[PDB]
Design an enzyme around this catalytic site. Sequence first.
Site, short mmCIF file in Angstrom:
data_model
loop_
_atom_site.label_atom_id
_atom_site.label_comp_id
_atom_site.label_asym_id
_atom_site.label_seq_id
_atom_site.Cartn_x
_atom_site.Cartn_y
_atom_site.Cartn_z
N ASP A 175 -34.80 29.13 -3.83
CA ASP A 175 -34.72 28.40 -2.56
C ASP A 175 -36.01 27.74 -2.13
OD1 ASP A 175 -34.00 27.84 0.11
OD2 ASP A 175 -32.88 29.65 0.40
N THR A 176 -36.10 26.43 -2.43
CA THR A 176 -37.32 25.70 -2.08
C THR A 176 -37.40 25.52 -0.57
OG1 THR A 176 -36.20 23.66 -2.33
CG2 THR A 176 -37.21 24.44 -4.40
N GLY A 177 -36.33 25.76 0.16
CA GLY A 177 -36.34 25.60 1.62
C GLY A 177 -36.82 26.87 2.30
O1 LIG Z 1 -32.64 27.29 2.44
C1 LIG Z 1 -32.73 28.12 3.56
C2 LIG Z 1 -31.85 29.33 3.58
C3 LIG Z 1 -30.49 29.33 3.02
C4 LIG Z 1 -30.07 30.80 2.76
C5 LIG Z 1 -28.60 30.96 2.48
C6 LIG Z 1 -28.05 30.64 1.26
C7 LIG Z 1 -26.70 30.71 0.94
C8 LIG Z 1 -25.83 31.22 1.92
C9 LIG Z 1 -26.36 31.58 3.17
C10 LIG Z 1 -27.73 31.44 3.45
C11 LIG Z 1 -29.47 28.77 4.02
O2 LIG Z 1 -29.61 29.02 5.25
N1 LIG Z 1 -28.48 28.07 3.53
C12 LIG Z 1 -27.35 27.62 4.36
C13 LIG Z 1 -26.01 27.72 3.58
O3 LIG Z 1 -26.18 27.23 2.24
C14 LIG Z 1 -25.04 26.82 4.42
C15 LIG Z 1 -26.00 25.74 4.82
C16 LIG Z 1 -27.30 26.18 4.79
C17 LIG Z 1 -28.40 25.39 5.12
C18 LIG Z 1 -28.12 24.08 5.49
C19 LIG Z 1 -26.80 23.64 5.56
C20 LIG Z 1 -25.70 24.43 5.21
C21 LIG Z 1 -32.50 27.27 4.85
C22 LIG Z 1 -33.86 27.14 5.50
C23 LIG Z 1 -33.75 26.20 6.70
C24 LIG Z 1 -35.05 26.11 7.45
C25 LIG Z 1 -36.20 25.62 6.83
C26 LIG Z 1 -37.41 25.56 7.55
C27 LIG Z 1 -37.43 26.02 8.87
C28 LIG Z 1 -36.28 26.56 9.50
C29 LIG Z 1 -35.10 26.60 8.76
C30 LIG Z 1 -34.40 28.46 6.06
O4 LIG Z 1 -33.61 29.18 6.66
N2 LIG Z 1 -35.66 28.72 5.80
C31 LIG Z 1 -36.41 29.82 6.34
C32 LIG Z 1 -37.86 29.42 6.63
O5 LIG Z 1 -38.53 28.67 5.65
C33 LIG Z 1 -38.56 30.81 6.80
C34 LIG Z 1 -37.77 31.65 5.84
C35 LIG Z 1 -38.22 32.86 5.26
C36 LIG Z 1 -37.32 33.46 4.40
C37 LIG Z 1 -36.10 32.85 4.08
C38 LIG Z 1 -35.68 31.67 4.66
C39 LIG Z 1 -36.57 31.07 5.56
#
Ligand SMILES: *OC(*)(*)(*)([C@@](*)(*)C(*)(*)(*)(C(*)(*)C1(*)(*)(*)=[C@@](*)(*)[C@@](*)(*)=[C@@](*)(*)[C@](*)(*)=[C@@]1(*)*)C(*)(*)(*)(=O*)[N@](*)(*)C1(*)(*)(*)C(*)(*)(*)(O*)[C@@](*)(*)C2(*)(*)(*)=C1(*)(*)(*)[C@@](*)(*)=[C@@](*)(*)[C@](*)(*)=[C@]2(*)*)[C@@](*)(*)C(*)(*)(*)([C@@](*)(*)C1(*)(*)(*)=[C@@](*)(*)[C@](*)(*)=[C@@](*)(*)[C@@](*)(*)=[C@@]1(*)*)C(*)(*)(*)(=O*)[N@@](*)(*)C1(*)(*)(*)C(*)(*)(*)(O*)[C@](*)(*)C2(*)(*)(*)=[C@](*)(*)[C@](*)(*)=[C@](*)(*)[C@](*)(*)=C12(*)(*)*
EC number: 3.4.23.16
Lengths: 99, 99
Positions: free
Chosen positions: A25-27
């Site tokens: 998960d690059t987020g």
């Molecule tokens: O990428 C992120 C996280 C993810 C986890 C999961 C997977 C599968 C199932 C459940 C849960 C999410 O949340 N995803 C979700 C699903 O796929 C449905 C939908 C979504 C999203 C959009 C649309 C649809 C996300 C992120 C966002 C943000 C960024 C920045 C700031 C605030 C918010 C998160 O949550 N991230 C966070 C931060 O970076 C701090 C931390 C520590 C550890 C883990 C996570 C986190």
Amino acid sequence: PQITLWQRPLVTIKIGGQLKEALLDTGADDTVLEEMNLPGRWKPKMIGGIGGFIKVRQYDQILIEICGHKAIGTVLVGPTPVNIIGRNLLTQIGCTLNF
Amino acid sequence: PQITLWQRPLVTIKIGGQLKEALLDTGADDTVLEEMNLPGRWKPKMIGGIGGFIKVRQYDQILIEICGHKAIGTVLVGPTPVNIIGRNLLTQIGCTLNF
Ligand SMILES: *OC(*)(*)(*)([C@@](*)(*)C(*)(*)(*)(C(*)(*)C1(*)(*)(*)=[C@@](*)(*)[C@@](*)(*)=[C@@](*)(*)[C@](*)(*)=[C@@]1(*)*)C(*)(*)(*)(=O*)[N@](*)(*)C1(*)(*)(*)C(*)(*)(*)(O*)[C@@](*)(*)C2(*)(*)(*)=C1(*)(*)(*)[C@@](*)(*)=[C@@](*)(*)[C@](*)(*)=[C@]2(*)*)[C@@](*)(*)C(*)(*)(*)([C@@](*)(*)C1(*)(*)(*)=[C@@](*)(*)[C@](*)(*)=[C@@](*)(*)[C@@](*)(*)=[C@@]1(*)*)C(*)(*)(*)(=O*)[N@@](*)(*)C1(*)(*)(*)C(*)(*)(*)(O*)[C@](*)(*)C2(*)(*)(*)=[C@](*)(*)[C@](*)(*)=[C@](*)(*)[C@](*)(*)=C12(*)(*)*
């Protein structure tokens, strides 16, 4: 490997001699795993996602093997919906995004 | 381009002539932008993450430009803390994860 995103980038990880599935998960800034027993003392941490915040326990210097690459860093445990491998470990395994 | 994960992977997007900043999120199944107005009929949807669920409005067939690349797909609009480009559009620009 080179992972495409037609499906969730799930990978097997090994932690505490157990195999689990986790999401690359690059987020995610950090790595959070579903409730489990980790050795040592923990510190408190709050993390905010899409739905709001949750309280997690923070353990430092945990060995985790991701797709056969050993990493050692901070791992959080709490009520996460899925096991998440975040940027803190992704960088240790030399993962990048390409397009 | 090749993007490292030392920092959040933020890119400039162009939507409805509006130029914005968004997160390339492989952990996100869908694309969700902060409250804005899209042309067309929308459908209500519930998406869940860390912290729980949020109610968003779903618009189909929206065109987005991600770093020069045009992409088409469903776009969700709601109370997301950051604009996120999920898998439904990362696939359209040929994004992959490499380690
Ligand atoms: O990428 C992120 C996280 C993810 C986890 C999961 C997977 C599968 C199932 C459940 C849960 C999410 O949340 N995803 C979700 C699903 O796929 C449905 C939908 C979504 C999203 C959009 C649309 C649809 C996300 C992120 C966002 C943000 C960024 C920045 C700031 C605030 C918010 C998160 O949550 N991230 C966070 C931060 O970076 C701090 C931390 C520590 C550890 C883990 C996570 C986190």
